[PDB]
Amino acid sequence: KRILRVTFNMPYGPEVIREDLDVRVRIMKAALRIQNRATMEIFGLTTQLRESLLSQFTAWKHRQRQVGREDELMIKVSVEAGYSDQGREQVSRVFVGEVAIVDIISPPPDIGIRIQCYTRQIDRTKTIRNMPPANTTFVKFVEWGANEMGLNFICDTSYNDQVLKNPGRSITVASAILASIQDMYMPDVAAFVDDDILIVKDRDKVIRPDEVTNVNSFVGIPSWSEWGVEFQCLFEPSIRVAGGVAVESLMNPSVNGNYVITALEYDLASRDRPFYIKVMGSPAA
Amino acid sequence: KRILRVTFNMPYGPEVIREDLDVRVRIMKAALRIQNRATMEIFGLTTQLRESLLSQFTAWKHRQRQVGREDELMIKVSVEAGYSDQGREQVSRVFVGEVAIVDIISPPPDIGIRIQCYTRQIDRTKTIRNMPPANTTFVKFVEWGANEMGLNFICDTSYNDQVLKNPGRSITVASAILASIQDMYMPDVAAFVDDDILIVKDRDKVIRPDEVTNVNSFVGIPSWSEWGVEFQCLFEPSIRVAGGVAVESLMNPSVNGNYVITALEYDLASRDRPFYIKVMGSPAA
Amino acid sequence: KRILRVTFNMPYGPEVIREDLDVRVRIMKAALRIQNRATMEIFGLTTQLRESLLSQFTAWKHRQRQVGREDELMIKVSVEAGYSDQGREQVSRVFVGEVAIVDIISPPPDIGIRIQCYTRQIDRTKTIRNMPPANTTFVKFVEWGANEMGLNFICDTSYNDQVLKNPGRSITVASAILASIQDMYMPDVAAFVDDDILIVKDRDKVIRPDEVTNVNSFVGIPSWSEWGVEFQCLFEPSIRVAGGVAVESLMNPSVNGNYVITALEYDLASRDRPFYIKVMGSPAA
Amino acid sequence: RSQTRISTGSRVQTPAGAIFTVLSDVTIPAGGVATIDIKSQEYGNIPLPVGN
Amino acid sequence: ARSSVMRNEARIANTINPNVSFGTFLDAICALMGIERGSDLSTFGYGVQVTG
Amino acid sequence: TLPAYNSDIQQALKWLHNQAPGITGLIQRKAQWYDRFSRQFWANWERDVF
Amino acid sequence: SAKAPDRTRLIAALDARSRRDALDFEVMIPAQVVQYDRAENIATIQPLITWVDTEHNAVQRHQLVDIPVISMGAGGFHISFPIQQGDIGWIYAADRDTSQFLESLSMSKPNTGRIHKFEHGLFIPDVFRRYTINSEDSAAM
Amino acid sequence: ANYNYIVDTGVIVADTADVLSDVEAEFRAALGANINLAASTPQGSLVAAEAI
Amino acid sequence: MKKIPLTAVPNQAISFNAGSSYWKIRLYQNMDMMNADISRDGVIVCHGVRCFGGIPLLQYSRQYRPDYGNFVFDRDADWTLFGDGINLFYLDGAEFAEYQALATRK
Amino acid sequence: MKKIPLTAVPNQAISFNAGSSYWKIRLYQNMDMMNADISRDGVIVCHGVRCFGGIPLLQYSRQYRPDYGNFVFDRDADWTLFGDGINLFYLDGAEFAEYQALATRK
Amino acid sequence: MKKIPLTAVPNQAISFNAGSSYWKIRLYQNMDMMNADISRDGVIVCHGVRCFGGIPLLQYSRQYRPDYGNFVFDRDADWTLFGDGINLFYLDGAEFAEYQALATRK
Amino acid sequence: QLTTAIQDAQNDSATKILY
Amino acid sequence: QLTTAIQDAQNDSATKILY
Amino acid sequence: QLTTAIQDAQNDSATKILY
DSSP states (O other): OEEEEEEEOOSSOOOEEOSSSOEEEEEEEESSSSOOEEEEEEOOOOHHHHHHHHTTOOSOSSSSSOOOSSTTSSOEEEEEEEEEETTEEOOOOOEEEEEEEEEEEEOTTSOEEEEEEETTOOOSSOSOSSOOOSEEEHHHHHHHHHHHHTOEEEEEOTTTTOEEESSSTTOOSSHHHHHHHHHSSOSSOEEEEETTEEEEEOTTSOSOGGGOBOOOOOEEEEEEOSSSEEEEEEOOTTOOSSOEEOOOOSSOGGGOSOEEEEEEEEEEETTSSOEEEEEEEEEOO | OEEEEEEOOBTTBOOEEOSSSOEEEEEEEESSSSOOEEEEEEOOOOHHHHHHHTTTOOSOSSSSSOOOSSSSSSOEEEEEEEEEETTEEOOEEEEEEEEEEEEEEEOTTSOEEEEEEETTOOOSOSSOSSOOOSEEEHHHHHHHHHHHHTOEEEEEOTTTTOEEESOOTTOOSSHHHHHHHHHSSOSSOEEEEETTEEEEEOTTSOSOGGGOBOOOOOEEEEEEOSSSEEEEEEOOTTOOTTOEEOOOOSSOSTTOSOEEEEEEEEEEETTSSOEEEEEEEEEOO | OOEEEEEOOBTTBOOEEOSSSOEEEEEEEESSSSOOEEEEEEOOOOHHHHHHHHTTOOSOSSSSSOOOSSTTSSOEEEEEEEOEETTEEOOOOOEEEEEEEEEEEEOTTSOEEEEEEETTOOOSSSSOSSOOOSEEEHHHHHHHHHHHHTOEEEEEOSOTTOEEESSSTTOOSSHHHHHHHHHSSOSSOEEEEETTEEEEEOTTSOSOGGGOBOOOOOEEEEEEOSSSEEEEEEOOTTOOSSOEEOOOOSSOGGGOSOEEEEEEEEEEETTSSOEEEEEEEEEOO | OOOBOOTTOEEOOTTTOOEEEOSOOBOOTTSOOOOOEEESSSSOOOOOSSOO | OHHHHHHHHHHHHHTTSTTSOOTTTHHHHHHHTTOOOOOOOOOOOOOOOOOO | OOSOOOOOSTTSOOSSTTSOSHHHHHHHHHHHHHIIIIIHHHHHHHHHHO | OOOTTTTTSHHHHHHHHHHHHHHSOOOEEEEEEEEEETTTTEEEEEESSOEEOTTSOEEOOOOEEEEEBOOOOBTTBOOOOOOOTTOEEEEEOBSSOOHHHHHHOSSOOOSSOOOSBTTSOOEEEOOTTOOOOOGGGTTOO | OOOOSSOSSSOOOOOHHHHHHHHHHHHHHHHOTTOOOOTTSHHHHHHHHHHO | OEEEOOOSOSSEEEEEEOSSSEEEEEEEEETTEEEEEEEETTEEEEEEEEOOBSSOSSOSGGGTTTTTOEEEESSSOOGGGBTTTBOEEEEOHHHHHHHHHHHTOO | OEEEOOOSSSSEEEEEEOSSSEEEEEEEEETTEEEEEEEETTEEEEEEEEOOBSSOSSOSHHHHTTTTOEEEESSSOOGGGBTTTBOEEEEOHHHHHHHHHHHTOO | OEEEOOOSOSSEEEEEEOSSSEEEEEEEEETTEEEEEEEETTEEEEEEEEOBBTBOSSOSTTTSTTTTOEEEESSSOOGGGBTTTBOEEEEOHHHHHHHHHHHTOO | OHHHHHHHHHHTTOOSOOO | OHHHHHHHTTOOOOSOOOO | OHHHHHHHHHHHTOOSOOO
């Protein structure tokens, strides 16, 4: 009994699209600069709901007009998925971001929309309000970037106490901040934004070491990869990105060990078979 | 009765490939610097027709030989499509361009070629014969580019009387002229080439205000999009690129209004179901 | 009776995977700077074989560790394909390269791996041990590049006696050598690496005038292209890259002639229908 | 002149101070401003009264 | 509707005589006597330029 | 050009209004007025132009 | 900053990617000096070419600090000018981070991965037309 | 309603589909927003008369 | 001298690029005659031009210099014989001036 | 002078970009009248404004000033006749000033 | 005041970002009481804190110092009434100081 | 999918600053 | 079909090799 | 398919020097 909700944020309020409507969310997240994506195929829309949603989702009013100083320029939508049995719920949060693309995939008799949301699509920000530090340490540049983007930060790396001269004075917008933080020191320590938290950590270290996820049931088989172990699983509302995993396989006994998560491929369909999440993991140090 | 013709231009003359042969033309046009594309799969070619066409289509005689000073270097082919009933024809023109690629997709017993043409594939032109202006206005640079390319021009923009110091003396060939005109002033005013007419205008303005196309019948449903309205229709020989459209929908009442065209996707199959044109449109100002 | 072998090279030795297991090798070689690639789908792997192979294939021990000074950093694998009837074999060599990526395509009850091998993936070389010539001719720079890469060379071109100033002092690694030899003089003379032999020749010349391959049997039809003749064939263990072909067709009588090879499309499936090689060829001079 | 002093500007006292500047401070052309400070560690400290 | 019809008919009947006509209607009265409408052009030439 | 033009005003009188007073009366009087104020007007105005 | 028929053909996204990758490729622009000291030859610099947004507004670039200033010297025979705040010139960009090279003046690694940014570069002074040449010195250095 | 079919560049005459739609809409606004303008009805007969 | 394709329908509108201009003629059957609405480059040039054989459409000099051209019917306009029997021809400036010179001495 | 598209439902909210501003009017049946809540550019201008024919919605100066426009009902508001019979029109600064000048001598 | 939601289970562990810190509270039924193990930013702060109504979980100063907050049970903890009837609330620094000042003069 | 990849490619090339 | 898009991301090659 | 081409594009951009 999968329970999947797509919650928009609109001037009227939140209009939650439940799992009764045919919905299909393909989220793909990674420990990269690039904004994590979520494609949303939603069918069964009424005329009123289509008017209330698609008309608000637009790329105008910031190009041929002005109507922009803060948020409400583009609609922010979150995704809450999970399971529910015996009356209890498991609705976690799996994506927060603003819509960028909107098309239609299925014509009548089932008018189904397909939107494309991206995390931190508010690169329509205020062109960097506070100037970046002139000479400062890496953790301090990270703190400035987090404060500029408005997100709380988790910075855990061994490169924090390294000074930089002009760390990002060429930055043009807030989104480019993450690009700069990713650009400097990129063999291991890659920074990203997971939902509302900006994470800057080494690629071989776990963000929350006490939050290891012991994994014993898999769909298919936990197989090797040129980096670590890769495996698909049924939706567990406790697996984030950059988290620690404690794979204990049966089919492949050599893949057992502790791994950190680098990528994540959510594929959630209320009215269809795919309700999986795919994990790319690398050896954890 | 759909009537679709592919008319080549070769030294012998025009050899019209009619709709009796299995022809499938996918044309994709847009208001960009990019050359609009036409992929046409033609089956039922005789040996003689294959030798008369494919042998002429080549990328040699301009790389390992000379045989070149003007046209006849590459075969220019036009596409004329439409409907016909009660004896009256509706054959308009939907593409003019030179072939670039030749292949076969379907092996025997149906030897069917697949050839790829782009508009203005004469980019290996006379390496800019007339020098670009030293200091001039945008309209006059556009006129110089149109004169160099040999195409008549439609320049309708509010940036015409803006002087440019030094407009495009880094241009190497005739094709890069369009890329340059596109490069300067590119929030809205994007220049393109439709058939043999070079259009330079603002993106929110129509080439011919008196030539709005009232649309009432669609295939599927006219849906919203990021910019404007997107919709598919049966082939109407009155819809061009960047033309004005007057969408009047039934399923979606909110998409009614006047739109300009940005992208066009012709898919014409004489002996198959797809005979539609897909229109991307944005609000018209 | 197709006979296909995938022969790895590991510390234990060569572990040949025969054609009894479901194997599917898709190779694409060409006369460019890019490394020719082979995708390998192998099913029916036992637990011990998976442990022996996938654990050896890794991208670690050279980024978060050291364990590298020479080969054995990554496993080198060759491919020997051919036919066999009446007791005689025809096993040639069709690919030699090192793995880079490993994934799983088919979940249980058939755990099937899919590895990705690239030719000359040992670019993790001694960062150019020997300095390039300061001033030198093209042939001698090619000889230096071949010596640095450790491969024997075939330099047959009309540009050999042309001097260069600083021929590749920005080169960082061994792989960039081929990119540089390709970069200079790129109207015709494109250098490439076929297996363990570095070939630098004009595009319209055959490496081997005496090794022309008379072809009379084709799968489908020998067709024209924008460059030359394109045709598919059953696996013949005598067709290399840049070799000479003597096409003698029946369906298309005017494609007959002598051609040189530019590309190659091996698709070998022991337990499936596709066992063909596709040849792109251009007119030979 | 016309300098913006840096957030968490590090300064060390002679007993290994390691003090960060709290406020985002921009100086003045006159040649003197005031900064708030916080010690790198939660420990008890007593800085020297002279600029170090 | 009838007032509009009478007004339009009165305008068209009045256009036959000048001083109450306008474009493409007084045009007709001029063309009756061959008074030519007098086309649109412009042209200069024979200029000189002092330069470097 | 050639294939007739009708334009009879009374064309808007169906078979239903065969014995009707009203609809028939209104259409007949409207036709008489449009005749007197268009066809007669243009006839005597062309006589004027002559 | 985008166009509607992008996201339809692959080459549309590809050339948009090329444009955005070449827009961040900082090489050289005119610039002005806000601070300078002749003892260390490093100057705080404000670039003189604005960024422009969608609404057609100029957002001023950020001041760049500790940019080395050229001196055109060899064998110790350098040339100096009274670099004061307000003079204009041209600022360049380094292929890699030269912050670690600046303090050492020797063979050093790039401190960070920032490639082709105006954060690290030079400033060559240039007076442009702001001078007067006597008629007696027509053909004369 | 009737616009100005006289204008200055000669008489601009529209098609009978357009004039019939105009008279239909005018009758609809005058008599009732949901009156049936069928050609067999008295109102439809009046509309057709005012369209000819 | 360019022949303009026609279609045997009562009312039609043809738009084309001829003589470095974007012409659009709407030909309609008005009672027992034909009239044409001519618009060049979007801006409308004339309304209700009664169509005759040999007689120029743009009748007034302001509508046809500098060398804008003109449209001529070979015969009196009749949409029943359009395409097969009655053709409309476009003349550029020089050819229309020569036609004027020939037709003004008859 | 722009009519606003309305729907014949009792309580609704319509938001639109008119007069270089982002207006939003929520119309609801309150007892036996219509009330309207008006919000411009996010901030809420007024709540519970009675809807009357001819009387402007934004009554006080502090709201329709400056040149922001106003909204006028042709007749007394009634959601049953919305879209057919009763319309709401938007006036910019000049049009509303002229409406005020006319309406103050009545 | 931030209401931490609870699930009617004997043993559970809730991890959340509250008050600029990464808290993790493991609540478990121990004998006839509830105990809680609280960790902040990964490191463990306290184990086996006996949970009582109104009375803060982090009891001594260095754990809720500075302005880190504290957790308060409105009633005596009981997992059978978790979510409906009993809730756990988080207070930031100033609010916990105000609560302490209120509760020290009762 | 081709279309989703194309749209993702288009996304990261849109910031406010035209040039 | 990604093959047509591949064939389209090759047209950017004029007579200038510049080289 | 296209994932193979994606993997190829990624492998192109791996060399032995970080900068």
